Design a protein around this nucleic acid. Sequence first.
DNA 1: CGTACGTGCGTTTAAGCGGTGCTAGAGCTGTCTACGACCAATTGAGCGGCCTCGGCACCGGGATTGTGAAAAAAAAAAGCTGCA
Length: 35
Amino acid sequence: KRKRSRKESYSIYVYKVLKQVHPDTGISSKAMGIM
DNA sequence: CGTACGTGCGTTTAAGCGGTGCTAGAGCTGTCTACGACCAATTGAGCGGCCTCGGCACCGGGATTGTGAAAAAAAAAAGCTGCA
Ligand SMILES: [Ca+2]
Ligand SMILES: [Ca+2]
Ligand SMILES: [Ca+2]
Ligand SMILES: [Ca+2]
């Protein structure tokens, strides 16, 4: 087909900050949208 | 029904005005280079795609908490007295 066009986001940085602050805590897709 | 506000006086206060005198600092000019744009080549961070397995949604069952009804007490409340 085509590979879907590139959509930048902050979500890898949010996940990295979350793992410093709450190592045993994750985040729903919506939550990450809000972030 | 109780009194906080609005009105209207006389007394007091300091804003406003116009002026002067002093200089902090706003803002302008000219110089020079540290810093940011631009570029080309390099490459690794982050993208999409994909797979998985554990959190969490949902369920049923039981424990727990809170509500309302009725009956019965506690209490204020009300109408009812003669006196003074
Ligand atoms: Ca912490
Ligand atoms: Ca009152
Ligand atoms: Ca100056
Ligand atoms: Ca991904």
